[PDB]
A = this chain, B = another copy of it.
Amino acid sequence: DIVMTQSPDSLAVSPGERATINCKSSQNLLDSSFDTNTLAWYQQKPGQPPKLLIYWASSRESGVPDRFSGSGSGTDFTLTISSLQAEDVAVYYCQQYYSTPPTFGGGTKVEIKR
C-alpha cells in the first residue's frame, strides 16, 4: 500500500508567521501523463471530520483563504499557511487519492506559539 508521511507531527509559530508542513508519498502521485497530482490537503478542527482545502497539490477549494497554498509534485509536497491566524489552529492532513479509498498521512497539529 501507499505510505503517506508528514513532517513534523506538530508545530507552532507566532501569530502572523508562516507555517510549513511536509508530506511524502511512497508512490509518485502524478496522474497518468498529466501535470496534476492526486494529492490533497485537509483541515480538521476538534471533534470534526477533515474538510478539503486543496486538490491537485495546489488548487484551492472554493471558499478556502488565500493564505493556504500547496506545492510539490511527484512524491514530496508542502502545505504552507503564509500568515497563521487563530482560526487556523487545527490538524492538517495530506491525502493521496490514487487508490480506492484514498488514505491520509498521519496529520500535523498546528498551533499558535505563546
> Which residues of A come within 8 Å of B, CB atoms?
31, 36, 38, 40, 44, 47-52, 55, 61, 91, 93, 95, 97, 100-107
Contact = CB atoms under 8 A, between A and B. Distances in A.
B91 A100 contact: yes
A105 B49 CA distance: 14
Q: Is the interface of A mostly helix, strand, loop or mixed?
A: loop
Copy number in this complex? Answer: 2
Given A101-B105, A107-B100, A52 B51 contact: yes
Nearest to A95: B49
B104 A102 contact: yes
Nearest to A94: B101
A49 B98 CA distance: 9
Contacts of A101: 50, 93, 103-107
